Amino acid sequence: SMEQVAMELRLTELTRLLRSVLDQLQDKDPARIFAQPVSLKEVPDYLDHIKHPMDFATMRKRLEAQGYKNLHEFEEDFDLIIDNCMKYNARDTVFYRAAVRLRDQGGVVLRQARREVDSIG
Numbered sequence: 001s002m003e004q005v006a007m008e009l010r011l012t013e014l015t016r017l018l019r020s021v022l023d024q025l026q027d028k029d030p031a032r033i034f035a036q037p038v039s040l041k042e043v044p045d046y047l048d049h050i051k052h053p054m055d056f057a058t059m060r061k062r063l064e065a066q067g068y069k070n071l072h073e074f075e076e077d078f079d080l081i082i083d084n085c086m087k088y089n090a091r092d093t094v095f096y097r098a099a100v101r102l103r104d105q106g107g108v109v110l111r112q113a114r115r116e117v118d119s120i121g
């Protein structure tokens with residue numbers, strides 16, 4: 001089908017845009033607090049607290065598998081990273097504060113990407 005090629009051309013390009021977004025969001029985490037899954041060896045009880053772990057590396061694997069259908073799905077993973085962190089860690093920790101900063105700073109990027117995805121369909 002010629003239509004499913006053109007579809008795959010869009011999905012491919014959504015992936016292209018989202019990858020740039022991912023890189024921008026991640027740049028706002030220079031301490032690499034959110035780069036890899038929370039270690040279940042280092043935090044054995046983590047899954048008793050957080051039912052849906054998320055991290056930048058895991059987002060990237062999905063991204064490269066063209067597993068994101070739209071910006072919303074991508075944004076919901078980004079929010080997971082932040083919301084998980086602000087639940088698991090108390091307010092006055094370096095982790096919680098890094099989440100707040102990433103949330104605020106990533107907000108600009110996500111406001112851009114929403115408009116640009118709407119524009120170019």
Ligand SMILES: CNC(=O)c1ncccn1
Pocket residue numbers: 033034038043085088089095
């Ligand atoms: C987002 N990272 C965390 O929440 C974390 N919490 C405790 C130890 C290591 N990492």
